[PDB]
A and B are shown apart, each in its own frame.
With several copies, the nearest count.
Chain A
Amino acid sequence: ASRVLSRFVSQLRRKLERSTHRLIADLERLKFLYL
C-alpha cells in the first residue's frame, strides 16, 4: 500500500537505461564505419 509504485518507476528507470544505452551502442559502430 505504501510500497507499490516505486518498484514500477524503478522498472521505468531500467527501461530508460535499456533505451539510452543504445546511444552508447551505436557510436562505436559509427566509429567502425568511420575509423
Chain B
Amino acid sequence: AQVLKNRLLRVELDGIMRDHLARAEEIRQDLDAVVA
C-alpha cells in the first residue's frame, strides 16, 4: 500500500545525501588554489 511514500522519502534522503557531497566537492576544490 504505502511503500510509495517510502520511495519519495528515500528519494528525499538520497537527495540530502548527495547535497552534502555537493557542498563538500567545491569547498574541497577551492582549498587547492592557495598553493601559488
Contacts and interface: CB of A to CB of B under 8 A. Distances in A.
A14 B16 contact: no
Interface of B, secondary structure class, is: helix
Interface residues on A, range: 20 to 34
A29 to B, nearest CB: 10
Interface residues of B, number: 28
Given A31-B12, A31-B13, A35-B9, A13 B21 contact: no
When A and B form their complex, which 4 residue pairs have the shortest distance between CB atoms, in order from nearest? A13-B31, A14-B32, A7-B35, A27-B17
Contact of A28 (B8, B18, B24, B27): B18
Interface of B: 5-6, 8-10, 12-21, 23-32, 34-36
